[PDB]
Amino acid sequence: GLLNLGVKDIGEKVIFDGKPSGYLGNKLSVSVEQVSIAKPMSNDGVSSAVERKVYPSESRQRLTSYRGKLLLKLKWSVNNGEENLFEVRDCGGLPVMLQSNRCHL
Amino acid sequence: MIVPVRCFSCGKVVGDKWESYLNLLQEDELDEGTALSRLGLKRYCCRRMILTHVDLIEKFLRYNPLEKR
Amino acid sequence: LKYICAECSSKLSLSRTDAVRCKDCGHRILLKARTKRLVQFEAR
Ligand SMILES: [Zn+2]
Ligand SMILES: [Zn+2]
């Protein structure tokens, strides 16, 4: 996908901390290697269990947006692979568009 | 939407002829002109009313808020 | 019995300090039902 190619070609952004470690202490290399958008779903409050399915008719009637969750896994890399800390972080509801592959129609 | 009761130009009642026109088209292999002639629509003002009707009411009725889908 | 759910079309009613949601499903949109009331018109 274009999103995956974009995060792959973004590269890794690196920072240092002062903890005497030739340059400055340990190294942090934060990057993203997977961006995934899911079809819109409704939590129905806090019930959860099997998530409900939202539809554009519901979005239009509610006068809200029709958005699906956006997922990113951060490659928290310390000292160039010495210790990697993967973690999937949600980034709010990305407005998805109708009749697309990430839509319920 | 639903078939107009009266022809606009003159005033002839064509609201009782849409179902008859559809039956004449479906059951018998009648052309539109022959069906309109059999229905009794001689003027083209009356003929157009039933010949060019769309009947969007059937499409509108598929969205019923008072019955489970 | 003055409301209709917007997804399962089941008639219901609401009260004070009552959740605005269907009693048969989780939908939170309730169309108001049309009741019997005189509405004078003109055939013009
Ligand atoms: Zn006429
Ligand atoms: Zn319901």
UniProtKB/Swiss-Prot annotation, chain A:
Compartments reported by the entry: Nucleus, Nucleolus
Domain of life: Eukaryota
Similarity section: Belongs to the RNA polymerase beta chain family.
Role this protein plays: DNA-dependent RNA polymerases catalyze the transcription of DNA into RNA using the four ribonucleoside triphosphates as substrates. Component of RNA polymerase I (Pol I) which synthesizes ribosomal RNA precursors. Besides, RNA polymerase I has intrinsic RNA cleavage activity. RPA190 and RPA135 both contribute to the polymerase catalytic activity and together form the Pol I active center. In addition, subunit RPA12 contributes a catalytic zinc ribbon that is required for RNA cleavage by Pol I.
Extra information: Three distinct zinc-containing RNA polymerases are found in eukaryotic nuclei: polymerase I for the ribosomal RNA precursor, polymerase II for the mRNA precursor, and polymerase III for 5S and tRNA genes. Present with 14100 molecules/cell in log phase SD medium.
Subunit structure: Component of the RNA polymerase I (Pol I) complex consisting of 14 subunits: RPA135, RPA190, RPC40, RPA14, RPB5, RPO26, RPA43, RPB8, RPA12, RPB10, RPC19, RPC10, RPA49 and RPA34. The complex is composed of a horseshoe-shaped core containing ten subunits (RPA135, RPA190, RPB5, RPO26, RPB8, RPB10, RPC10, RPA12, RPC19 and RPC40) where RPA135 and RPA190 form the DNA-binding cleft. Outside of the core, RPA14 and RPA43 form the stalk that mediates interactions with transcription initiation factors and newly synthesized RNA.
Official protein name in the record: DNA-directed RNA polymerase I subunit RPA135
Chain's gene name: RPA135
Parent-protein start and end of this portion: 59 to 172 of 1203
UniProtKB/Swiss-Prot annotation, chain B:
Protein name per Swiss-Prot or TrEMBL: DNA-directed RNA polymerases I, II, and III subunit RPABC5
Cross-link Glycyl lysine isopeptide (Lys-Gly) (interchain with G-Cter in ubiquitin), where in sequence: 59
Keyword list, A-Z: DNA-directed RNA polymerase, Isopeptide bond, Metal-binding, Nucleus, Ribosome biogenesis, Transcription, Ubl conjugation, Zinc
GO molecular function, one term: DNA-directed RNA polymerase activity
Family named by the database record: Belongs to the archaeal Rpo10/eukaryotic RPB10 RNA polymerase subunit family.
Keyword flag Oxidoreductase: no
A Pfam family assignment: RNA_pol_N
Alphabetical list of InterPro entries matching this protein: RNA_pol_su_RPB10, RNA_pol_suN_Zn-BS, RPABC5/Rpb10
Miscellaneous comment: Present with 5300 molecules/cell in log phase SD medium.
Gene this protein is translated from: RPB10
Any single biological process term in GO: transcription elongation by RNA polymerase II
Binding residue positions for Zn(2+): 7, 10, 45-46
Purpose: DNA-dependent RNA polymerases catalyze the transcription of DNA into RNA using the four ribonucleoside triphosphates as substrates. Common component of RNA polymerases I, II and III which synthesize ribosomal RNA precursors, mRNA precursors and many functional non-coding RNAs, and a small RNAs, such as 5S rRNA and tRNAs, respectively. Pol II is the central component of the basal RNA polymerase II transcription machinery. Pols are composed of mobile elements that move relative to each other. In Pol II, RBP10 is part of the core element with the central large cleft.
Cellular component GO terms held in the UniProt record: nucleoplasm; nucleus; RNA polymerase I complex; RNA polymerase II, core complex; RNA polymerase III complex
Entry's localization field: Nucleus, Nucleolus
NCBIfam families: PRK04016.1 (NF003089)
Curated annotation (Swiss-Prot), chain C:
GO biological process, one term: transcription elongation by RNA polymerase II
Binding, Zn(2+): 5, 8, 22, 25
Zinc finger region(s), C4-type: 5-25
Taxonomic classification: Eukaryota, Fungi, Dikarya, Ascomycota, Saccharomycotina
Keyword Ribosomal protein: no
Oligomer status and interactors: Component of the RNA polymerase I (Pol I), RNA polymerase II (Pol II) and RNA polymerase III (Pol III) complexes. Component of the RNA polymerase I (Pol I) complex consisting of 14 subunits: RPA135, RPA190, RPC40, RPA14, RPB5, RPO26, RPA43, RPB8, RPA12, RPB10, RPC19, RPC10, RPA49 and RPA34. The complex is composed of a horseshoe-shaped core containing ten subunits (RPA135, RPA190, RPB5, RPO26, RPB8, RPB10, RPC10, RPA12, RPC19 and RPC40) where RPA135 and RPA190 form the DNA-binding cleft.
Organism this protein belongs to: Saccharomyces cerevisiae (strain ATCC 204508 / S288c) (Baker's yeast)
Function per UniProt: DNA-dependent RNA polymerases catalyze the transcription of DNA into RNA using the four ribonucleoside triphosphates as substrates. Common component of RNA polymerases I, II and III which synthesize ribosomal RNA precursors, mRNA precursors and many functional non-coding RNAs, and a small RNAs, such as 5S rRNA and tRNAs, respectively. RNA polymerases are composed of mobile elements that move relative to each other. In Pol II, the core element with the central large cleft comprises RPB3, RBP10, RPB11, RPB12 and regions of RPB1 and RPB2 forming the active center.
UniProt family annotation: Belongs to the archaeal Rpo12/eukaryotic RPC10 RNA polymerase subunit family.
Protein known as: DNA-directed RNA polymerases I, II, and III subunit RPABC4
CC per GO annotation: cytoplasm; nucleolus; nucleoplasm; nucleus; peroxisome; RNA polymerase I complex; RNA polymerase II, core complex; RNA polymerase III complex
UniProtKB keywords: DNA-directed RNA polymerase, Metal-binding, Nucleus, Peroxisome, Ribosome biogenesis, Transcription, Zinc, Zinc-finger
The keyword Zinc is annotated on this UniProt entry: yes
Residue numbers of the full-length protein present here: 27 to 70 of 70
Main location per the UniProt record: nucleus
